[PDB]
Every structure is written in structure tokens, then in C-alpha cells.
Design a protein around this ligand. Structure first.
Ligand SMILES: Nc1nc2c(ncn2[C@@H]2O[C@H](COP(=O)(O)OP(=O)(O)NP(=O)(O)O)[C@@H](O)[C@H]2O)c(=O)[nH]1
Ligand SMILES: [Ca+2]
Ligand SMILES: [Ca+2]
Ligand SMILES: [Mg+2]
Ligand SMILES: [Mg+2]
Ligand SMILES: [Mg+2]
Length: 166
């Protein structure tokens, strides 16, 4: 069956792990344990196709950049995650995108921009601001909450649908 190798990137604390765990394991991780490099695999049906998702959950932050380079190399699509209550995380996105382009040696990599923590009310990144960034990259913008599950399947499945257009 078809395998989709997805990679989740973005600043520390934005919810990469919580998103992945919610998708794969159907619960919300409330605590914060920084990630080094974790993988999850699960068989799912997406648009009638039985397939295997292989999801790489990466370490966030400029300090782990070198480590990510090699682990990121076989990624077929990337979720670029910021949190809607963390302006710096949004400002950091372009650096993650640039890393992706470096590791894939391509300007045309399947990606989705994800604004996570949309259950929180202390919003400092407005939807339109993120829409505009995504538009510049030619990719979708989707908001998610790993806490409530809002948008979580949509984000990951949309990434699969972007891979399929490549
Ligand atoms: N309210 C709310 N909290 C969230 C959401 N997603 C993650 N969090 C919280 O934010 C914290 C960090 O989440 P985590 O997934 O560990 O972040 P990360 O991006 O994997 N960090 P790292 O790069 O260090 O591994 C946790 O306390 C988690 O519960 C969300 O959608 N809503
Ligand atoms: Ca929990
Ligand atoms: Ca390279
Ligand atoms: Mg993590
Ligand atoms: Mg503002
Ligand atoms: Mg398209």
C-alpha cells in the first residue's frame, strides 16, 4: 500500500507532538516533554485509499537545526506549525520553510501551514496574517487544536492531498 512520509516542524512548544499524538492515539497530551526525534506509523483510509502514514515528530528550535537536517531528508510532505498565541513562532516559520527547501533541494515541496492552539483566546496571529503567508508559499493554511481535535485530521489529510498533487 502507499506510504506517506510526513514530517512535523516548527518552534518549540507550538504543539507538534500534541497534534501528532491526537491524530494517531486520540488523546491530548497536556504536559510538555520536549522531543528529540520520534516516529509514529498508522494505517488509515484517506479518500478511499488505504495507506500508511509515517509521521516524524521533530525537535523545535534553532538549536536543533543540524540534527533535523538528516532525519528530515526522506520527508515527502511537511506540516509547518506555529501557535496562534505565539507571534515569535509565526515569525520563525520562514526559517523552517527554508530548512525544508535546503533538505529537499527543491522549491516545490508539499507543505501545509498550521496555526495550532486555536482553542486559546490570547490570539496574537490573526487568521488573515497566516492566510497571506501561506498564499505567498502557494500552500493551504489550516487552524487546529490538539486539545479539542478541531482541524487535526483536516491538517494531516490535507498534507496527504498536497503530496498527491506533486
Ligand atoms: N490549549 C492548547 N494547548 C496545546 C495545544 N497543542 C499543544 N498544547 C500544549 O502546548 C505544550 C507544548 O506542546 P508539545 O506538543 O509538547 O509541543 P512541541 O511543538 O512538540 N514542542 P517540542 O519542539 O519542544 O517537542 C503542551 O503543554 C501541550 O499540552 C493546543 O492545541 N491547545
Ligand atoms: Ca491528557
Ligand atoms: Ca541540501
Ligand atoms: Mg514535541
Ligand atoms: Mg498584530
Ligand atoms: Mg494545488
Amino acid at each position: 500500500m502507499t506510504e506517506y512520509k510526513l514530517v512535523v516542524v516548527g518552534a518549540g512548544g507550538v504543539g507538534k507532538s500534541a497534534l501528532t499524538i491526537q491524530l494517531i492515539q486520540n488523546h491530548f497530551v497536556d504536559e510538555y516533554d520536549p522531543t528529540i526525534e520520534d516516529s509514529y506509523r498508522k494505517q488509515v483510509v484517506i479518500d478511499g485509499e488505504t495507506c500508511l502514514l509515517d509521521i516524524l515528530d521533530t525537535a523545535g528550535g534553532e538549536e536543533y537545526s543540524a540534527m533535523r537536517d538528516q532525519y528530515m531528508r526522506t520527508g515527502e510532505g511537511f506540516l509547518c506549525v506555529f501557535a496562534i498565541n505565539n507571534t515569535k513562532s509565526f515569525e520563525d516559520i520562514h526559517q523552517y520553510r527554508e530548512q525544508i527547501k535546503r533538505v529537499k533541494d527543491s522549491d516545490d515541496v508539499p507543505m501545509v501551514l498550521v496555526g495550532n492552539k486555536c482553542d486559546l483566546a490570547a490570539r496574537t496571529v490573526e487568521s488573515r496574517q497566516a492566510q497571506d503567508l501561506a498564499r505567498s508559499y502557494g500552500i493551504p493554511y489550516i487552524e487546529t487544536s490538539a486539545k479539542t481535535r478541531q482541524g487535526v485530521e483536516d491538517a494531516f489529510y490535507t498534507l496527504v492531498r498536497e503530496i498527491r498533487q506533486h
